[PDB]
Symmetry: D2
Subunit: 117 residues, 4 copies
């Protein structure tokens, strides 16, 4: 069974992003539907897969990371609106049998994502 | 006076992303407002800045890159829905007097962005 | 020396969205007396190494270089690129300051770009 | 005709890396040859191209950046040896007629490069 997972990495300290609030949305033609909310654990991942089994369906999604609140909780005092506040990763799942690992490699001034393994 | 600019780089071929359609949005409490549509030129940039002068205001923004259409137009046939289709780059501008360069370094399976 | 640390890597092919399978690599220690070859490996079907590159008492404080034969990998995948390839052997130099901790240094690579970081 | 250039970006503050010392080497079968030593300017670039005209030839090169020294001068207090100290970017130039722009997007715990434009 394919599963959707994520991983937040803080490249300002080379450490997992701990406590990063995130939300998963299913995206359709008329609107978006919240599927799940989660908080990254001590390894920067989620204790449970964001989607697994029959819940992982072919479609379009959005992973929204509260990266700005995280860096503010780490002591960063940045002028608002921060350049990196809520990071929105829009992506599509075309094959429900394959795993989809969509991490976030983020600083207050940069971020990158990819389809990992 | 500050200006907003972007730049698209295709890392499957090490060339600028040419012909990438763009849509810039201001994001507020009640919703989003379309500010500008544009297309990347032969250098993967815009002939005019996305925002400049008084049009560059303090606030939240969303710069959407029609990257999936670009890679489909380059011959890359990929099953639907594509992992990289419309790339949403949400960011904030805290100082209207500064230049903000928000490029995109993109493949069909990865993208990166940063404040340049 | 500590027994608890381990050096690892992970090759991700972002032209395919798949792990880089069959990529040859070598680990070097780098110091004032030169570079010392420590291990050669080939990435498995998950783009990782079946055995750790360095771990435990063999994992020591100092400078290191991981060398990825990215150019041969992409050539083996059908990419026809004029030589010398822009991305051929990728050299990731990095330092290890605490021998008891784990260091995961992955490679996110295309024939025209790559990135690396200290992961978890 | 072709020109080789670079650009250092500090993604910990969202600013160009200013004062970054660098060195360009040619890489051949019998050893490496220093081509140029330079320092980034206020825009994180070099006032002159690293290689231009007849100096730009087909072959392998290495750009070495003293990134760790730069982060020390910016106040970052990291144990030694730093995870990121001297960043080595090995790359090959196949067509001396084309411009090659090879930037460095770096934090003390991450870096990326690409064939830019």
């Amino acid at each position: 069974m394919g599963k959707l997972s994520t991983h937040v990495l803080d490249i300002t300290k080379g450490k997992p992003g701990v406590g990063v609030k995130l939300a998963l949305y299913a995206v359709g033609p008329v609107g978006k539907t919240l599927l799940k909310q989660a908080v990254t654990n001590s390894d920067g991942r989620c204790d449970e897969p964001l989607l697994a089994g029959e819940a992982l369906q072919v479609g379009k999604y959005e992973l929204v990371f509260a990266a700005g609140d995280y860096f503010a909780a780490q002591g960063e005092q940045l002028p608002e609106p921060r350049f990196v506040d809520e990071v929105v990763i829009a992506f599509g799942i075309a094959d429900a049998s394959q795993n989809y690992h969509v991490p976030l490699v983020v600083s207050p001034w940069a971020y990158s994502t990819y389809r990992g393994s």
